[PDB]
Amino acid sequence: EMEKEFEQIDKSGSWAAIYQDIRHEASDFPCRVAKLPKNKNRNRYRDVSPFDHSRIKLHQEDNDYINASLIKMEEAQRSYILTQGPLPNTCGHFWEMVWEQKSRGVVMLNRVMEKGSLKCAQYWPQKEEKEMIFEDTNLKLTLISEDIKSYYTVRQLELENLTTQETREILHFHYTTWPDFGVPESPASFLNFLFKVRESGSLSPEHGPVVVHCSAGIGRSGTFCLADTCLLLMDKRKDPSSVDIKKVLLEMRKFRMGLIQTADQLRFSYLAVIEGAKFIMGDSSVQDQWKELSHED
Ligand SMILES: CNC(=O)[C@@H]1Cc2ccc(NS(=O)(=O)O)cc2CN1C(=O)CCc1cccc(C(=O)O)c1
Ligand SMILES: [Cl-]
Ligand SMILES: [Cl-]
Ligand SMILES: [Cl-]
Ligand SMILES: [Cl-]
Ligand SMILES: [Mg+2]
């Protein structure tokens, strides 16, 4: 049971060992498409690639490759697309994927500039009056509005398929204070943000999978998805004791490599799930408390 395990790992100081056993046990599947010469400039990092079996294929129209994976959680009945931060030449591909996969929400857990370097392209418009046209994939993207909080921003975007003139509203949930290879400020800050994504309807099974990304699309993105899936599993069953967090992470790692990149991110995931369980099991009042503790205003 997660809280008993947490306390035992903490008391024995064994987060590093627990985390390394996950790394050891994790699936290794081929990434031959990602490694084709023609795809080199579509990958941000040499050592982060989608497995062939779970990669998202683009439907246009000479190279179907994007560095993105479908994390299909069968038991939880929820799917996520995890992807790297788009590159200057892959922003059209990114929005093509969003369109084709019928995603309603994009969750971004990094900043464009981190530690002096460009870790993600500026792939969405910052001003209403300066829309973006992706000529390669025939899409237009307009900023409709934004709600700027202290450590996250929610944007309403309009994505238009220029070939058909169909438009869709996309919600962008941007966590602006989650350091690379780091953790959120508190369980409260994290959960307040997760619940904002959930409240939007973006995770509904009536939509395509939410797109979640950071820079590599594995460390921060993996932490987010693990917490969400574990909370969903216990919610479906109304049984916190039924959820085996390490098993869930190993299952997710069947679909994309390297999910959760530090031992402290794993530790944080446990803290987030244990805290979120209070809400799932009927203490409604905790949600307001998280909002207060997150100092979002
Ligand atoms: C310190 N690592 C790096 O800077 C690069 C590039 C990079 C950048 C930023 C990262 N953080 S993220 O995913 O944006 O939150 C993660 C990584 C992962 N990296 C990797 O090389 C991943 C290698 C890897 C690949 C697959 C599995 C594992 C694992 O043992 O968990 C590790
Ligand atoms: Cl940014
Ligand atoms: Cl910086
Ligand atoms: Cl970039
Ligand atoms: Cl950072
Ligand atoms: Mg203005």
UniProtKB/Swiss-Prot annotation:
Substrate binds at residues 180, 214-220, 261. GO terms for molecular function: cadherin binding; enzyme binding; ephrin receptor binding; insulin receptor binding; non-membrane spanning protein tyrosine phosphatase activity; protein kinase binding; protein phosphatase 2A binding; protein tyrosine phosphatase activity. Its main location: endoplasmic reticulum. The modification Phosphoserine is found at residues 49, 241-242. Changing residue 49 to A/D: No phosphorylation. It is a peripheral membrane protein. There is a cross-link at residues 214-215 (N,N-(cysteine-1,S-diyl)serine (Cys-Ser)). The keyword Metal-binding does not apply. The modification Phosphotyrosine is found at residues 19, 65. The modification Cysteine sulfinic acid (-SO2H) is found at residue 214. Keywords: Acetylation, Endoplasmic reticulum, Hydrolase, Membrane, Oxidation, Phosphoprotein, Protein phosphatase, S-nitrosylation. Oxidized on Cys-214; the Cys-SOH formed in response to redox signaling reacts with the alpha-amido of the following residue to form a sulfenamide cross-link, triggering a conformational change that inhibits substrate binding and activity. The active site can be restored by reduction. Belongs to the protein-tyrosine phosphatase family. Non-receptor class 1 subfamily. This is Tyrosine-protein phosphatase non-receptor type 1. The gene is PTPN1. The chain holds residues 2 to 298 of 435 of the full protein.
